[PDB]
A paper describes a structure:
CotB2 adopts an α-helical bundle fold that is conserved among class I TPSs (PDB-ID 4OMG17). Upon substrate and Mg2+ binding, TPSs undergo a discrete conformational change from an open, catalytically inactive one to a catalytically active closed conformation.
FGGDP is functionalised with a fluorine atom at the C2 position of its hydrophobic tail that interferes with the propagation of the generated carbocation(s). Upon binding of FGGDP the 12 C-terminal residues are structured to fold over the active site, resulting in the fully active and closed conformation. Surprisingly, we did not observe the entire FGGDP molecule. Instead, we detected clearly resolved electron density for a single diphosphate moiety and for a ring-like structure positioned in the active site that we interpret as the reaction intermediate 2-fluoro-3,7,18-dolabellatriene (F-Dola). Most likely the fluorinated substrate alters propagation of the carbocation and hence we do not observe the native product. Additionally, active site residues R227 and R294 make contact with the oxygen atoms of the diphosphate moiety to compensate its negative charge. The closure by the C-terminus is initiated by formation of a salt-bridge between D111 and R294.
Residue numbers in the entry:
A (entry chain A): 14 to 307
B (entry chain B): 9 to 308
Amino acid sequence: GRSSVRPYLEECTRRFQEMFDRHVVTRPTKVELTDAELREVIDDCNAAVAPLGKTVSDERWISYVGVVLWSQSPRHIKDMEAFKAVCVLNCVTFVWDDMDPALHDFGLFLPQLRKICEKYYGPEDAEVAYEAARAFVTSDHMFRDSPIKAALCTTSPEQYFRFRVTDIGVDFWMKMSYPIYRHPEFTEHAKTSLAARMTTRGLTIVNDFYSYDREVSLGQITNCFRLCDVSDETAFKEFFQARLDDMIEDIECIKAFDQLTQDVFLDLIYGNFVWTTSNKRYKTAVNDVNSRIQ
Amino acid sequence: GAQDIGRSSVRPYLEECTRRFQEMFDRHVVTRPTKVELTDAELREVIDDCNAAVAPLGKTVSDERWISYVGVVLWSQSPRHIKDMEAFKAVCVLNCVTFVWDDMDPALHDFGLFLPQLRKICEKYYGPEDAEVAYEAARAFVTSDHMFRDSPIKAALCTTSPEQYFRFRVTDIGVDFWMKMSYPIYRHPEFTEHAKTSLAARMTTRGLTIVNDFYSYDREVSLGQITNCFRLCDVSDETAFKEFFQARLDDMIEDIECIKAFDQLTQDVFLDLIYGNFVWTTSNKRYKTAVNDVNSRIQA
Ligand SMILES: C=C(C)[C@@H]1CC[C@]2(C)C/C(F)=C(/C)CC/C=C(/C)CC[C@H]12
Ligand SMILES: C=C(C)[C@@H]1CC[C@]2(C)C/C(F)=C(\C)CC/C=C(/C)CC[C@H]12
Ligand SMILES: [Cl-]
Ligand SMILES: [Cl-]
Ligand SMILES: [Cl-]
Ligand SMILES: [K+]
Ligand SMILES: [K+]
Ligand SMILES: [Mg+2]
Ligand SMILES: [Mg+2]
Ligand SMILES: [Mg+2]
Ligand SMILES: [Mg+2]
Ligand SMILES: [Mg+2]
Ligand SMILES: [Mg+2]
Ligand SMILES: [Mg+2]
Ligand SMILES: [Mg+2]
Ligand SMILES: [Mg+2]
């Protein structure tokens, strides 16, 4: 009844895309990694999660990494070592997101994050990236079955998106991504988390729509469509339009930022959507790339 | 009289809004904030550090002005939970000297002179790790306050909706900075994590900002400052003002009721911050007249 948004899949996909075409216009661009670059990334990912004891397949890594390939801003890239770092860090904390909390070993995993950060970044940037990775994995862990999560995800969209600034990983993403661009304004917006606060709703509403069926099946409550009656087409449509309006208002305000920063913000939101709709992770509730790692 | 005088002041609403705020706190927070009493030695140690830090910028600040700045720390921390009084004094100093920065013409903003003083304060009162977090947060605040003077981003975030506006204020009202320099006071691991993710700041931004904005509106409008949520409604129209004000009270209440899901120590800290800021704001000459000897623009 409320267990699926499948009836709305085609209409909502078309409405998301129309919104992007009218308000962002320019398509996101996929970063093409060389084979050598992709192997270096996947090798670092496997090394980082090996102490945790679970095998991750190449195609699951590729499912995770696609968000970085599609949602950065390739024409503004300056530092491909920072880009590779974001690939690795994004992927290995994605595994953490998918893991049963019994597998979460901070003593084994935190040094791996530190190693990744020092390898690919300079001394100061490595500290910023590591703290943000540390804060993300700690947050994902401590909020599993937390009353705080229950209160923030069941009260209002406002409370929910406030939780997601950290929990969807976008604050972490900004703080590990600014070395890719070496653009002083973007670096400040990343470090104040204004960059994350501006892009949270656009990332989260899309992720939530397409991951609803999986999350509802697993008992995960971190999803804004749980705030509406999805079995009621009229109530769903009103809620979905309110969320579309949220995304538009953010995008229109993002266009007040400097031309480079606004490119990075918009490529992030629109790229996430392109990646989400072509990724098997977001298609069936349980499959070989989104199954709980138990 | 070409000016929109009718929209230039919330003075007609002063008594009724103050009473409504207080009723809200009494119904939803209940327990009073507690003022930290500093020794005369401690206070003088704080003020001498404050004067040392802003001396390179060229402007004298009176003890009365410092005391006007420092009261928010005295009233809005959580005395029952304090473990580290050196961290508390760091927050007194860091709060006060960045208040001066907030009040200064941007021509006085000298990062080369001022950033080393902030680093010196942090290195004096905190351990090495805590000092780096507090310095980064102070740096990011003073850089933000400077960057956004006359900025199109500020205009867009402050004139679109309450949601865009409060998103700006998570940094601009200084509360993220506040959390990241206050967690060493409490040495409470959950509070430290909520500080470092900025969830602490996000939970408390609206309660701090709505109160600050109401009582600093007249001064800010007279100085042409646009960072104030009541510029989003027509304060000259009583019906529209009261509808907007009720919407802001509802925002505060929703945050406070969600804050009550946090662990007991964290929620005490969050609620003392919001309610203490209200007690301080309503007792402080800074928030009583548009221009006076403690809130006037510090001019180049
Ligand atoms: C941050 C970005 C734009 C996107 C937004 C959706 C995301 C793919 C989903 C999710 F799985 C996260 C929370 C776990 C990993 C966190 C960061 C690194 C990645 C967070 C991901
Ligand atoms: C460095 C301090 C702490 C920063 C500096 C200027 C500030 C905007 C002043 C004002 F708005 C305060 C007294 C209300 C909220 C207090 C804290 C959370 C942060 C307050 C701010
Ligand atoms: Cl560096
Ligand atoms: Cl934030
Ligand atoms: Cl320390
Ligand atoms: K809306
Ligand atoms: K409201
Ligand atoms: Mg998650
Ligand atoms: Mg997940
Ligand atoms: Mg390095
Ligand atoms: Mg999801
Ligand atoms: Mg397969
Ligand atoms: Mg200010
Ligand atoms: Mg001010
Ligand atoms: Mg004000
Ligand atoms: Mg009028």
